[PDB]
Swiss-Prot record, chain B:
Subunit structure: Part of the 50S ribosomal subunit.
Function: Binds to the 23S rRNA.
UniProt family annotation: Belongs to the universal ribosomal protein uL15 family.
Keyword vocabulary terms for this entry: Ribonucleoprotein, Ribosomal protein, RNA-binding, rRNA-binding
Name of the molecule in the record: Large ribosomal subunit protein uL15
Organism, scientific name: Listeria monocytogenes serovar 1/2a (strain ATCC BAA-679 / EGD-e)
Keyword field contains Ribonucleoprotein: yes
Ribosomal protein found in the keyword field: yes
GO cellular component: cytosolic large ribosomal subunit
Length: 95, 97
RNA sequence: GACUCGGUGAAAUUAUAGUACCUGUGAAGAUGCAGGUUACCCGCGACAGGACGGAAAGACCCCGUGGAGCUUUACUGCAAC
RNA sequence: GGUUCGUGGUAGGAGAGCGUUCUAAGGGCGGUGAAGUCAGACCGGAAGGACUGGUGGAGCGCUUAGAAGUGAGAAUGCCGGUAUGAGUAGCGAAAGAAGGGUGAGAAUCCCUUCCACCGAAUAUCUAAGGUUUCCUGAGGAAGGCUCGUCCGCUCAGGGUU
RNA sequence: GGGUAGCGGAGAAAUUCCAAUCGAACUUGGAGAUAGCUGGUUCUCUCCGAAAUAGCUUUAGGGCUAGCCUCGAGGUAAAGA
RNA sequence: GAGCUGUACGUAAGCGUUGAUCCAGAGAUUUCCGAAUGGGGGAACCCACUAUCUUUAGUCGGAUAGUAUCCUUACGUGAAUACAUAGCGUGAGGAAGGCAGACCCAGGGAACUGAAACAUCUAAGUACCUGGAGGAAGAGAAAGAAAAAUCGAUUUCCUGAGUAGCGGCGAGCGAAACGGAAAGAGCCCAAACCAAGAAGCUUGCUUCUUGGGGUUGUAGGACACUCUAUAUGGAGUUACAAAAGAAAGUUAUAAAUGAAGCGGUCUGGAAAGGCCCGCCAAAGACGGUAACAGCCCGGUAGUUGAAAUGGCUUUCCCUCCAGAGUGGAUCCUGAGUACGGCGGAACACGUGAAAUUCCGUCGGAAUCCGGGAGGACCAUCUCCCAAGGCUAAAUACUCCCUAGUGACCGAUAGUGAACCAGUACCGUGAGGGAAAGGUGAAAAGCACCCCGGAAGGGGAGUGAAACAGUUCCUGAAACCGUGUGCCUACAAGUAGUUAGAGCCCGUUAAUGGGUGAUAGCGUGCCUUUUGUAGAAUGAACCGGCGAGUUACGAUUUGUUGCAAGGUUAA
């Protein structure tokens, strides 16, 4: 996938378009990605072992990768990604 | 089938035989020899090139249907007595090959 | 057992039905057609005259140039001897 | 364009058409709501076609042509669903009673007492066959011809030296 | 616990039994057997519109040719009524 | 190159940039059953023996290997029987079984059916069984086809031709050659004879073994003669002899890189859509993404790529190799064969006038002055040389793999099977054989409150929607209900239709809609029939599904093109 955990992305489609964030998890089997403060859902949680008081929890739900563009840390702009081989390991490049 | 009435074909007799050595000739009536230019001798191979006969079965026979105008020197495998009497009548020589 | 009550709950059948009687009529035996005669609406227990009731494409009978099993001095065969 | 004679119809011949799915080309509709579906008092000589509104939530017309798994009311048709009969037949040989308990709930589970039945069996073993039905705890959707707290049923754990 | 198997077994003999099948088991295939028989065969309007006879037929509820219908075309002292 | 520990709408413990999970090549491990093979057995079990270790104080235990049968072959031993031989033992090889129900060759081989019956005939050498099996098989380098005065192995396609023919001359069956194409490729033996052995007494001559030689028609070979080659050249594992290896190239099996819009607005839950602007394009394939994207993602065109394994192609190595002419004194040139009789079968050809080919049985040539065929047969002529073998390609089929395509299906369709299906279930067994797809973009899968034992519900909340609430897109009809506008308890009803008050409504607004006191008229639908309301048939109802099709020929009409010409097939 063109983004991985820890990357800053821009959201380009959906109810949260224009909002940027830090990829918290990646689910490459589903081509989905979890972004901090994006696609916030209200989980109606019974009390259990984790969250013992229960409650209506406001937390992040995954966005399809095709809906995020990588933030070039140089210009702070969304970009497409290239791949250049720098001696040892290949590294992502911007446009 | 006639519903059990003996079928027509079985009421009437078989006739004759097929000759193994039967010779069918390609026919060239005179009227089509007017296609050629006076003085010309007319062979089989010439009648092929002109496309008056495509297949020459057994050979070329000339028959007397219509009438000829040009003094040809026709040579074919056979001739109608009448055809031979009509080519000469105009002023041409028939020879058999 | 039936019947009433409480529980549970099938089936064959079924063109749609507000589904009388008589005499006639008609594919010649009509709940349904005609002319009459009777008959307020809805059920329950009973009975089987009718619905040519249900069941099973009649076993009888005939037909089919349909089968099958059996017979023989039918025809043609085959084993065996 | 008009006169004249026609226009009942089974088997059947002839003709012109409607609609369905698909293709091509052209031209369109559609999240400001496609197909489908429901409703209506609209239009055409028929097959049929629109329009409007609801439902629906993503595809679909029209024109010309082409190609066909192209149109159903009947086949004791096939498959599915649902009626009718009907709260009807039946609930599969048999003796139960009360008290106490349990429980949301008890003719139907547990206990007690009395009663009744089998007793050359309806008792006790064992082989076949079955294959976990055995035991304990929990359960009561379905199964049990009713009920059910119960069970040869469901769920866990066990159990055969 | 074994044996005999379908053109076959078995039969104190009935056409009796051979897995709720037996005048020849079951299953799969040949196989969409064949069926001059029965049933069924789906949209519309327009024009015309029969026959249920003859002859022959192992034919008689089948078929063929002819007759009677329809569509097209032709010639035609119009020959038809 | 950052996540991962399969599904599947779980808990736990963990792993990973010191490179995991994942993808491809190679390797290792691979219980037990199964041909199953140490013996047995009711498959997936039981029980051994022989070695060699191992454990125990020793039994009792453990590990590793070997141990089936037949065939061929070598070596040993070895009966009646004296030598032998059978038999027995050991060691090498080999087989066994399975299946792609296809295709192919062979052995065996129906019947229904058609013939309007049926027996010859057909169906049909089909189905089926059995064997062989190969990637193809079969056929195949003329004792051929013919009748120019000539072809040159086989196979397949077009054509010949529904002809010639066969046929209770019925039903039907039905060629071939010529011509045109695809593809092409030719070869090795047996025998004369030569050499060298062995075995024999044929006692110096015959019969077997190995090598050389040699392959064909008025001839070829042997054999004499001569001319050049003795690897100069040539050929090869696809026949023509048979094993071997290397190297380079290429293809396959993982991948890499890869242009251009977060453009502005509108609607919207969301934009890829509308409107308005740009841009890339050897890339406007396909898919996904919250609606329809060439410019968001995976990609796509183009361009790169392989440590490993396999395939193919070249080249090298390696292995292997004699060809012309001239003479016909003599010799050789496939024998229980060819042919023939008898009985069958195959040939399109049913015994026919029946050539040709094969089987069983019996008889049985010639053998270079020789032999066969040309559809009885003879003569002439022509063409050919059997009784030995091998041989690629063009052809057939598809259990499979890779890439794709479809005026093919879209959940009763399409496979029986979109779903844990040859399952469940049925059957003693062979065998028969289903039903069953869709929450949402995302679980955001309904905290909390309330009635209830629970189920279920009502709120609250999530969501665009919950009348999307874990079998959850849409949600028709039958069928079941609740409500109520009109009618209905003196009526005889195929249920409507025409006339028609009254009452209630108000539309796609037009000589409208609902209901219907009362009056007239009125015997469902279908099938089958001379005739059916029929007391004849069929249908409980609703829904889906459910019947003149295609191929190749014939004929006729219409259309179009060309026209005494028209048209190509493979
Ligand atoms: Mg004659
Ligand atoms: Mg009751
Ligand atoms: Mg009356
Ligand atoms: Mg009674
Ligand atoms: Mg009756
Ligand atoms: Mg009957
Ligand atoms: Mg009239
Ligand atoms: Mg009419
Ligand atoms: Mg559609
Ligand atoms: Mg249809
Ligand atoms: Mg129906
Ligand atoms: Mg009753
Ligand atoms: Mg009663
Ligand atoms: Mg009762
Ligand atoms: Mg009881
Ligand atoms: Mg007793
Ligand atoms: Mg118990
Ligand atoms: Mg119960
Ligand atoms: Mg219990
Ligand atoms: Mg008797
Ligand atoms: Mg029995
Ligand atoms: Mg058949
Ligand atoms: Mg049938
Ligand atoms: Mg008329
Ligand atoms: Mg007769
Ligand atoms: Mg063993
Ligand atoms: Mg017949
Ligand atoms: Mg890109
Ligand atoms: Mg918006
Ligand atoms: Mg949508
Ligand atoms: Mg989409
Ligand atoms: Mg001969
Ligand atoms: Mg013979
Ligand atoms: Mg024959
Ligand atoms: Mg001869
Ligand atoms: Mg013989
Ligand atoms: Mg001859
Ligand atoms: Mg002949
Ligand atoms: Mg020879
Ligand atoms: Mg299906
Ligand atoms: Mg559906
Ligand atoms: Mg639904
Ligand atoms: Mg009165
Ligand atoms: Mg009244
Ligand atoms: Mg009646
Ligand atoms: Mg009925
Ligand atoms: Mg035609």
């Amino acid at each position: 996938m063109h983004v991985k955990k820890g990357d800053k992305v821009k959201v380009i489609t959906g109810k949260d378009k224009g909002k940027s964030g830090k990829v918290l998890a990646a689910f490459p089997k589903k081509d989905r990605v979890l972004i901090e403060g994006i696609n916030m859902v209200k989980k109606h949680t019974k009390p259990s072992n984790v969250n013992p008081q229960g409650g209506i929890l406001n937390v992040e739900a995954p966005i399809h990768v095709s809906n995020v563009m990588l933030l070039d840390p140089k210009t702070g702009e969304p970009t497409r990604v290239g791949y250049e081989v720098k001696g040892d390991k290949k590294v992502r490049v911007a446009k | 089938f006639e519903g059990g009435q003996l079928p027509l074909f079985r009421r009437i007799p078989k006739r004759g035989f097929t000759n193994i050595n039967r010779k069918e000739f390609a026919i060239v009536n005179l009227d089509v020899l007017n296609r050629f230019e006076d003085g010309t001798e007319v062979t089989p191979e010439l009648l092929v090139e002109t496309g008056i006969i495509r297949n020459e079965k057994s050979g070329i026979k000339i028959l007397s249907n219509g009438n000829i105008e040009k003094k040809l020197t026709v040579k074919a495998n056979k001739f109608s007595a009448a055809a031979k009497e009509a080519i000469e009548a105009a002023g041409g020589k028939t020879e058999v090959i």
